[PDB]
Structures are given as C-alpha cells and as structure tokens.
Design a protein around this nucleic acid. Structure first.
Ligand code: MG
Ligand code: MG
Length: 958
RNA sequence: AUUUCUACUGUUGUAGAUGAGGGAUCUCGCUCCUGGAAGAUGGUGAU
RNA sequence: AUCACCAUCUUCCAGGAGCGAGAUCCCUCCAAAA
RNA sequence: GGGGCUAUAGCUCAGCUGGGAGAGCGCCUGCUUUGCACGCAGGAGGUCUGCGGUUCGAUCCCGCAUAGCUCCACCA
C-alpha cells in the first residue's frame, strides 16, 4: 500500500590509510558544517506553563483518595514552606532560570522520610500503643493494634538477635545470620509495605507525582543537550569511487572552502573508471529555519531583506492556513535576492515549483526536496594526491565482509541498500533511496578478556566503524512525532486506519500464546465460509490448494564425517544439508548421493497450522525442527536465573544451602511445594489431614489410586501454577530445594522449593542428561550481586528472547509474502490483546513468555511496507485490552486484537463441539483435524484468525 | 571467522534477523560514605 | 549498688553516590553567506 | 487469585426516588393463670457491611477492604 518515508541506521567498517568515544563527526552537505541550534522557543513556554501548580488542584493529580483530616494536614505542611513570596512547582528543574520556587516533589519526600524516621525511634524505645495515637505521625497513626504489636514482636526479636558479639564460633555464627536476615529483617519490611493502609496510599501518591515530574524533565533535558550536540561537526566528506570500491575522504573546514572552489573547476567529462563526488541539497525544514529562525533578535539576515513578501511578522501570521504558506514560499524563491545566495537549479525549480499549483502542503515539500537533491560528478584523472597534500585530507576505505567475498546473489539486507543506492536505475527515480547528509565515526577498543585467552576475531584488535542513516521511499509523505500530545497520538492512529478498505483485505493470520507451545500460527480465508455443514467440511479438506509447505527432520541424531575428517550433526546446522552446493563441497558426495540423502532425511507436507516454537527458514524451506538449539538457550537462562536469585547475596558468610534433585524426599518438601503451587486463600482452608492426600494427587500417578471425585473438585480448585509433576510425565521436571540444616532427617526446617527446568526429549540430541553440571554452575552465595565477572550469565534473558523472535518473524513475513502474491491483496495479523494484568501474570509463571516482544517486533517489521503507523507510546492506546465482548476489535494498521473468550473449545465447523475430542468432533459432525492441522492445539490459532477476520469486515460495514 | 545478534565455523564461509546515540521514572539484588536510635564487653570516676 | 565518661564492637533506620536484572518513557539524526 | 453481584436492629427482612430509620422473629421487664401458657403492655436494640469522597441536602451518586459462584486464557 502507499508508503511513507522511513529511516534506518546502517553501518560498515572503515580501514584507515592516512590520519565508543565519538572520535569524529562530519556532514556531506557543505552548508550544514556551521549549524546553529534549533528554535525550541515555542515549547519552553508550554512546559513552563505546566510546571507551575496552585496547591488547590494538588489532589486532582492522582486516583488515590485521602480523607479530609489528612488532606488539611498535608496542605498545611506545604504552606509552611511557601512563605516569603515563594512559588510552587511540580518539581525542581535546573533550567529556565527560575528562582524563589518550592519543589512539591521534594516536600513530599521530606514528610515521608521524617515520619518513617520518627516511627522507628518510637518503636525501638518501647513506648505503648496509646502513646503513639496521641502523636503527630498522621501517616502512621490509626493502624490497628493487631499490626502495631505484630511489628513489635519482630522488633524485640530482631534486637534480641543483635547479641552475635557473644559468639566465638563462626560455624555457629553463620547459622545465626540467616535466621536474622531472611526470617526477620525481610519480613518486618513487608508488614509495613502491604498492611498500612494510609502508608500504602502515600506510597502511591508520591510515586505518581515523581513520575509526572519525570515526564516533563526528560523532555526539557533533551532540549538542553541539542544546543551542545550541534557544535561537533568538523569535516566536509567526499566519496571517491574506484574499481567498484568506494573510498572515504574527509577534509577540515579550514580547507573545505578552497577545495570546493577548486573541485568545481574540474571536467564533468563522463565515465573514466574513477570519480569524485559531493552532495548538494535543500529541504523544506531548512527553509523555515532560514526565514523565521531567531527572528525576534532581529539578526536574521533573511528578515533584513524579503520583508516585502511578509503578510506583522512571525510564522503564526498565516493563521494556520496551508495555501497562504505555499504562495509566500514560492515568492521567496521567486524573489531575486533568494536566487543570489541559494544554490539551486533555477530553471528547473522555476519551471517545476514556482509556477505550479499544489493541492496540499505535503506535495510542496516533496517537490522541493525531490528536485534539490543532486549527486554531482567530476572525473579528472589521478585525483587522489592533491587532497592528501594540499588539503591535509584524512582517508579511509569502506569495507565489509559481503563487499569482499567472491560469490554474489546472497547478500545481507543492510548491504543490499548500499549497493542499490549507486545504481543508475536509481538515479533516474530522483533518488528514492536517499543518503542523508550527516555521518559519524566510532573507534572501539579490543576486549582484554579476549586478548588474554587467545581463531580469527574482531574483538582481538581495534576497529573503525561508520554509522550512517539512510531513508527509503524518500518521495512519499513524511511523518514525525516529536512533541505530540499523548492524546494526539490516538488521533493519529485513527486517521491512518482509514487507508484500509472492506474489499482490499483477502486473508488474515492468527497467533496464540502459551507455555507448552510458545506460539502457534494459522490462516483463515473467506472461502472457508460455506453455508452447509457438508460444504464447510469439504472446503477445509482441500489442504493441497490452501496450505503451505514445511520440511521436517526425520532423525535428529543423524550425523556425518566431512572433507577434513571432522564430524557434523544435522541438528546444529541443517543449512549444511539442505543447500545442494554446500553438501557436495563439504562431504564430497556426488549428485546422485545428495538426492538420495534428501529423499531420506527430510519429510514434507502441507498444513493449515504450524508451531512457532522451533520453526525457521532454511534455504527457502520452512523447517519445523530447524531451531531446537535456540529454544534450549531459553530453557537454560530461565533455569540459571531462578537458582541464582533464590540465594542470599550478603557480603558476609551465611549458612544457606541449596541443592538439585529429580524428586522430593520428605513430607516437609512435598508440603512446601504444594503450598508454592496453590492459591494461598483456598489452600489455607484445606484440612491438615486432607493436605497430605492432596500431596498424593500432585506427586503420584492417579492411575494407581482412588481419589474420589468430590476430592478431585478440591485438588482442581486449589491449583494455580498448572503442570504435570509426576515421575511419568512427558517432560519430567527438575527440582531445587533450600534449607539451613546439614541433613534433612525428615525433621529439618525448609524455606522454599521451586521447579526449575523441563526435560524435553529433543534436548538429549544436544546435551546429555549429565549436563545439569552447567545449570548448577550458575548458583552461589560467595558472589555478592554487584560485580560483573565469570558469572555473566544473568545478562542474557532479554537478548536470548530476541533470538526466538528473530526466527518467528522470518516465517511470518515469509508466509505473508507467499499468500499476497497468490491472492493479490493485503491481510491482517491477529492476536489476543489481553491487556497488561494478564501479561504480568504470564511472565510470572515463566520468565520466557514471549508475548510482548513478539508484538513489538512485528511493528518494526511491517512499518517498512507502510502497513502500520509510527508508534510513539504503545501503552497510551492499548492498555486494559478487550474483555467480555465477542464482537469488538482493536486495530493498529493491519495488526488487530480481539477477545480470546472461548476460542480453544469450539469446533471450526460446529459451534457446540469441544476440544480434547481425539481429533473428531464429539457432536458427530464430519470435522476431523487428523491431517488438516499440525496438532489439536492448532484449533486456537485458527479460531483466533477466524473471529478476527469477521469482526474487522463487520466493523467496516457501518 | 560477522556493521551487530543467534546456531555453526574455515578449499570461495553458511542459514535467519538487524535504527543507532544519549538520557528520565519506577521495582528487585548489592556495596561505600555521613547522621540517628537500641544494646554486649574492658576500664575510669561518684554512691 | 545506683548515676556519669573513654574505648573495642553488634543490629535497625534516614540521606548521598555507585554496580547488576526487569518494566514503562523521551529527544537528536538537513543550513549559512561575506 | 487475571472480570462481575450483595451487605438494614441480636436473627429474618420492608425501604435504596437525593428533601422518609422501620416491620416480624429473638431478648428483658411488667401484667398474669392453679399451671404450662393462649394472651395484654412497655423497654433495650443502628457507626444504613467497614472506611472515604461528591452534593444546598445522600442507606440512594462516586472509590477502596472481607464473605459467598463464573470463565480451557494459562495445563495429565
Ligand atoms: Mg490464546
Ligand atoms: Mg494454546
């Protein structure tokens, strides 16, 4: 669909021949070398108009409600500071030249601190309940004597444990500490955090006020820095092309003036196997900066002239109309003076801009930008030495791996644009792909952790990197977001969604999240909607015409020996077994052998649904098992973190002990885990004898017992972290326990128990079961958690989640293209949008839940096609997602969202049938998911897509 | 073995993804500095 | 046996700064002619 | 534990409309038969679930806490 301008930051490597921290910066355009800071003068007035507060409206900045008694006290406390003509602000800003101001954020901090300080001295010195109630601690008063004493029970016990001086046996001292830090100090804090009603409220009133100030502080902070960033440009830059390779030439501004005066005299003869280059351009934004920039000071020379064309002065004079601006600017270029200082193709701009008429201000910007961007050429011989000698020009060479290899065709996308920029087919489109005129250079040191241990490498020696920015679709409308109001974004999305049409959409996907199968995919079409049950069943059955083709590895253990005597396994890297060129080269097999292997190892078939847990794109084929290793790194990092964050990381010795087991031994552990898996309220009501039967339910095989159904109704209601923990489970679980005593003895006290890891069958292809050695390695207590060292394992939970998404975006984008070039139309991505409360729960039951990342990486992908708008603040528009509405739909471009209510338990053909039916609809209709769907779990994604498509078309009807 | 990441990895490297820099608020884990309170123990002086 | 003082030293609380992990958020990336 | 409903005197409950705190049962007392007592009479009983806000005026509108049932969304 019609696109809009898009930017990206692509980089390469520079090789130095003549001469992280930003060692240098430069701009291609010769006129930006002496930039001046932007005119932010308008915004500063607005934010200054938002800092100031008037007391009386304070309590309207938060949802928290305070009674009148506290209401009067807090205002009274603040007023005591406003004497002597002070004025009130929402926060302290070290800018804007303000004086005699009182920071509301600071004052709220002070009263909270003093009260918490006073209440600590009171409780420790032994005063009584009725003595507290008469004091001025209006925040901590009114707590029940149930809480007041409960706090003091810990306090005396804590101070009573401060007699560790008397101990002269470290073996016994280390046992003392754990009984102090964990059981007492960490428990007293929670009591005050979640049970003091008035205290909790003020813990939220202060936070929101701290966040509101934070919002308008960073906004102002970025305004200050810009005035420092514009100073650092130093060099005009050139690109000298030679034998198909580019060189990078710098030149300081002490010489840039003379060099251009010399270079412009050289012959633009044509093509002679060597060229020098230099860019020229003007743009709409730069024109306003020239006419109305810094006008109030009166030093804007473009306002010393040109005044005749003015409407009165200032941009606002045009009353916001579009066409009046157009005519004024045309007159600016139509005036003689402007044509005497500017450098533009007068005859073409005269013929194409000044005399024309535009229907909107957008087209005027494009026409101006379109025509003023030029790429000159001077091709005189032996133009290298003069720059080095006369112009003291530093020189580099632009190089990268793809730019050095021999074979072509396969090349990385960020190298696909650079080589596509210089082509002649692009120069005839007025540079649809554009190289913007500011660049920068960095220099990274080698990693000392790599030099010491050492294999060709990058980190083993320093590197010069070039960071550039390139715009695609340069001749489409531009869209920017800086300083929009958080309520204008919701309006921007609403307008952008008018592009799509009821008839344009031809299909839709559907994605379902989970924990046994991290993501499942399906597809739906309007053709599946026949009227009768017989036709509906028959139409879906034609999988050959609708579905997609997928490979499946047959024997994950299959390996081979290669041309160097080394051994290679299929599961580590299939792409050495699918690409014909690779198999022949490496294993030295013949053409007949390669076809024999392919026919034997890789099954194939066509299906409607798929599993995104392990699918990847290899040499043009979808391999459902091509990504096993990258899932192992996710069930490892989750395990390596849980057994590191359940230790105690004091700087001082402690006796906490933690050990791994495949099963649980005593009734203390089994009862402690069953409490960890159940609802606290519902579990507590369970009888003390019934609790042990409930343990037999979880940890033994139900087949060899007689749990009565009435008892099942309880065991099925007390459970909230679902799973299967028996010894005969499909993916047996691995356990970890914590205690202080040396040996269990079936009597020892135990503090926690937690499931860590899941033993998936496929993982045995990579690592043997004896590789819990590598899971265990990442737990310790001697490591204080404020050091980065050999134990650098924590860092990679985020980075390891983007690996799985990197493999689920290729598949989703590969299928999207496939169908668009077969049905001839765009389509919708659909996924349940269950708000943010359901998302946090999801991450709670598994650190590796991929929901929020898998969304934020779909917006990044489909913007390039112009299908979704630019996204400023996602949570502003789509928090508290749909719920309890089987018709609504939320839409950001083509990425819709729907209610997941009842999806996974309905037959695609019927409305009454349920799942868990053994692939045949229990209502006795003809549906059979035997060889339509990858698995019975695929019905959810199919239903999610099915519902999504109908809701969207329904909305467009009216 | 890579502009960068992930899995591999040296007879031309292979397969997927890739907008970077700097900064703000909050939650959890930890360290150093300054101040306040409760308290063991040696010693000293009055009683 | 009461009260005062020096000293080793134990715990808890407040404020300042710094390191590791997670969540939300913001700006910059095209201007000048003597 | 991620969305919804009710809660009036000791018990059961009418009343919930912004201009209005009540009924039956239970209890105490007096009356009283020979005797249970059919019966007569009066009294005690309220933080309108607890807390808080809005309003000229609130059991009535608005926001939190506890007690009861509902959803394969997360899964032997
Ligand atoms: Mg779902
Ligand atoms: Mg599912």
């Amino acid at each position: 669909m019609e696109t809009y301008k898009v930017t990206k930051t692509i980089r390469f490597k520079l090789e130095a021949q003549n001469v992280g921290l930003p060692v240098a910066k430069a701009s291609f355009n010769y006129y930006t070398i002496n930039k001046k800071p932007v005119d932010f003068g308008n915004e500063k007035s607005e934010l200054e108009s938002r800092l100031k507060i008037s007391i009386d409206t304070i309590f309207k900045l938060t949802r928290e409600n305070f009674s009148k008694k506290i209401e009067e006290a807090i205002t009274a406390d603040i007023q005591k500071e406003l004497n002597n003509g002070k004025t009130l602000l929402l926060g302290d800003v070290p800018m804007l030249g303000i004086e005699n101001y009182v920071s509301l954020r600071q004052i709220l901090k002070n009263i909270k601190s003093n009260q918490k300080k006073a209440f600590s001295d009171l409780m420790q010195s032994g005063k009584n309940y009725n003595e507290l109630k008469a004091t001025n601690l209006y925040l901590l008063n009114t707590i029940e004597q149930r809480q007041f004493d409960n706090y003091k029970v810990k306090t005396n016990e804590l101070e009573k444990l401060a007699v560790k001086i008397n101990q002269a046996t470290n073996d016994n001292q280390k046992k003392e500490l754990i009984s102090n830090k964990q059981r007492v100090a960490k428990q007293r804090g929670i009591i005050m955090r979640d049970n003091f009603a008035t205290w909790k409220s003020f813990s939220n009133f202060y936070r929101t006020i701290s966040q509101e100030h934070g919002k308008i502080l960073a906004l102002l902070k970025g305004i200050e820095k810009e005035r420092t960033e514009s100073q650092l440009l130093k060099y005009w830059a050139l690109i000298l092309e030679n034998n198909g390779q580019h060189k990078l030439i710098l030149i300081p501004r002490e010489k840039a003036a003379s060099c251009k005066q010399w270079i412009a005299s050289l012959n633009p003869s044509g093509d002679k196997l060597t060229k020098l280059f230099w860019f020229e351009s003007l743009t709409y934004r730069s024109l306003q900066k020239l006419c109305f920039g810094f006008t109030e000071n009166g030093n804007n020379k473009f306002n010393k002239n040109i005044q005749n064309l003015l409407p009165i002065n200032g941009e606002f004079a045009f009353q916001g109309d579009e066409q009046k601006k157009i005519k004024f600017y045309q007159s600016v270029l139509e005036s003689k003076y402007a044509q005497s200082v500017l450098n533009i193709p007068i005859q073409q701009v005269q013929a194409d801009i000044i005399n024309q008429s535009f229907a909107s201000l957008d087209d005027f910007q494009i026409a101006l930008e379109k025509i003023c961007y030029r790429l000159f050429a001077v091709v005189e011989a032996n133009i290298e030495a003069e720059l080095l000698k006369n112009d003291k020009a530093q020189i580099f060479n632009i190089t990268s791996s793809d730019l050095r290899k021999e074979a072509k065709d396969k090349i990385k996308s960020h190298t696909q644009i650079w080589k596509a920029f210089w082509t002649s087919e692009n120069k005839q489109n007025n540079f649809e792909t554009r190289l913007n005129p500011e660049i920068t250079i960095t220099y990274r040191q080698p990693k000392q952790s790599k030099i010491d241990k050492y294999k060709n490498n990058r980190y083993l020696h320093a590197q010069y990197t070039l960071i550039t920015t390139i715009s695609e679709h340069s001749n489409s409308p531009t869209k920017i977001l800086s300083f929009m109001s958080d309520d204008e974004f919701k309006s921007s999305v609403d307008t952008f969604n008018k592009k799509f049409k009821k008839d344009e959409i031809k299909f839709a996907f559907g994605i379902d999240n989970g924990e046994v199968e991290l993501s499942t995919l399906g597809v739906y079409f309007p053709a599946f909607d026949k009227t009768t049950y017989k036709e509906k069943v028959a139409e879906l059955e034609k999988v050959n015409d609708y579905g997609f083709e997928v490979l499946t590895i047959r024997n994950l253990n299959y390996k081979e020996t290669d041309y160097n005597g080394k051994e290679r396994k299929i599961i580590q890297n299939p792409s050495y077994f699918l690409k014909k060129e690779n198999y022949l080269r490496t294993f030295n097999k013949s053409e007949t052998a390669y076809q024999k292997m392919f026919t034997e190892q890789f099954e194939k078939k066509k299906l409607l649904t798929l599993d995104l847990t392990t699918a990847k794109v290899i040499c043009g084929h979808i391999v459902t098992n091509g990504d096993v290793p990258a899932l192992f790194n996710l069930w490892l990092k989750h395990a390596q973190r849980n057994i590191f964050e359940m230790n105690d990381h004091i700087q001082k010795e402690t006796a906490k002990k933690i050990v791994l087991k495949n099963q649980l031994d005593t009734d203390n552990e089994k009862l402690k885990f069953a409490e960890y898996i159940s609802k606290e309220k519902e579990f507590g009501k369970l009888n003390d004898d019934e609790k042990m039967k409930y343990t037999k339910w979880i940890f033994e095989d139900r087949d060899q017992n007689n749990f009565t159904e009435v008892e099942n109704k309880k065991f099925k209601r007390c459970q909230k972290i679902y799973g299967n923990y028996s010894t005969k489970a499909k993916a047996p679980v691995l356990f970890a326990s914590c205690f202080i005593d040396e040996e269990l003895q079936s009597v020892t006290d135990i503090f926690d128990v937690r499931h860590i890891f899941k033993k998936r069958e496929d993982f045995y292809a990579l690592k043997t079961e004896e590789e819990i050695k590598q899971l265990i390695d990442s737990y310790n207590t001697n490591r204080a958690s404020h050091d980065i060292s050999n134990e650098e394992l924590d860092l990679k939970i985020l980075n390891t989640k983007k690996a799985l998404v990197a493999n689920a975006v290729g598949v989703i984008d590969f299928l999207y293209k496939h169908y668009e070039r077969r049905l001839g139309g765009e389509g919708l991505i659909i996924k349940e949008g269950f708000g943010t409360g359901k998302v946090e729960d999801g991450i709670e039951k598994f650190s590796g839940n991929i929901y929020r990342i898998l969304e934020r990486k779909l917006y990044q992908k489909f913007q390039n096609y112009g299908l979704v708008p630019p996204i400023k603040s996602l949570m502003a528009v789509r928090a508290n997602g749909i719920e309890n509405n089987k018709n609504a739909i939320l839409q950001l471009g083509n990425v819709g969202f729907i209610d997941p209510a009842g999806t996974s338990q309905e037959c695609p053909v019927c409305i009454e049938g349920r799942l868990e039916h053994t692939t045949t609809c229990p209502n006795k209709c003809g549906f059979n998911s035997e060889r339509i769907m990858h698995s019975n779990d695929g019905i959810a994604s199919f239903n999610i897509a099915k519902r999504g498509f109908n809701n969207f078309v329904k909305s467009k009807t009216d």
